Symmetry: C3
Subunit: 148 residues, 3 copies
């Protein structure tokens, strides 16, 4: 009954010459996300939500973004926590994300050793507003529930 | 003891020539949303907690089953789907971010609409109001955002 | 087993001539956050998440941007928030949060922020978390026009 919640945020710029990788899925696109890692904004947001729920700090303190997510899960477990569920949203004007959501969920559940029914990924546009609306970047946000 | 959490986001442009409807409430104002940003966010948080995908998967602008549906009917159908999936709703919290108009006078009405649609006691539904301190498109009154969190249990 | 969750958001402009106070920490810097109170964006977001979890409205309902709160210490506001949440019958189980800022560097101050929040909520450190982010050079955040914070809280009645 010792439940905890975590919340995470990430954003990266969309630039020429990078592959677009979100939720571990390589999505055909003219630009990709800019970062030191592969810049997987969704996995990063979920990673931060998991560190937050476990009160283990953040991705900046601790560190392929799937390997990092798998290591995050290891650290959460090390602290005595079990992951109960993850929910998330990706915000991008383009490209279309719906065809790729199922693969992302499958990847996240594998990396977190969760059944598919405890993992969720939602897709949003930003209604043409802000840097998101202009296609300058992609945001992700996440929530995680854990228990010790 | 099988609890789950969900989170939701929505945003729309604020322009003259549309009514302003938030949380099922029509608010007198010179501009409107181009589109109930609060109900959408809550709807998405509930689907998320149940791991049922999102509002786009359930209620396609394509689908004829829901053409013209009010954001409240969609919220009600969301809740029915959440229950059949085996989940009971424990609470909802949310924030509306808008530079104008003032939203405090309307909060109890929004809470009442949401609690009704989700068949929840009023004290398990919360709506919070923020400005964006004149920063960004929110700050310029070009759009309004909402965010939501939901706790459920199977 | 009567758990509830809350979520919070805040933002303030970054301006010359103001103290920069985040998570109760006074951070040396040429600019500070603008607000009616001390404009502690992180404590405000956490305060809203707590009121939200307890279904008690928001920081605007409880602490109106009244001369009673000009210059107000946002740690005193957070403690009063916690007092009201407890009066409503709720116990706090944990808090998580994120600060998004182009500058200054926040990592050196995070542990102090966590300690302040934990003291104010009468929680052990291992139930309080503060994460620091940049906005990867995007938007008004990327231009340093303001600082955002967001929070999540779990409580139980
Ligand atoms: Zn990232
Ligand atoms: Zn919407
Ligand atoms: Zn504030």
């Amino acid at each position: 009954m010792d439940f905890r919640i975590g919340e995470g945020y990430d954003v990266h710029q969309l630039v020429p010459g990078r592959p677009l990788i979100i939720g571990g899925v390589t999505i055909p696109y003219e630009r990709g996300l800019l970062g030191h890692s592969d810049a997987d904004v969704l996995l990063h947001a979920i990673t931060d939500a998991l560190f937050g729920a476990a009160a283990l700090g953040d991705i900046g303190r601790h560190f392929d973004s799937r390997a990092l997510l798998r290591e995050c899960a290891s650290r959460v477990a090390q602290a005595g926590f079990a992951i109960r569920n993850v929910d998330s949203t990706i915000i991008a004007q383009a490209p279309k994300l719906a065809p790729h959501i199922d693969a992302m969920r499958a990847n996240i559940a594998a990396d977190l050793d969760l059944p598919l029914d405890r993992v969720n990924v939602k897709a949003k546009t930003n209604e043409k507003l802000g840097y998101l609306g202009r296609g300058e970047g992609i945001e992700a946000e996440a929530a995680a529930l854990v228990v010790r």
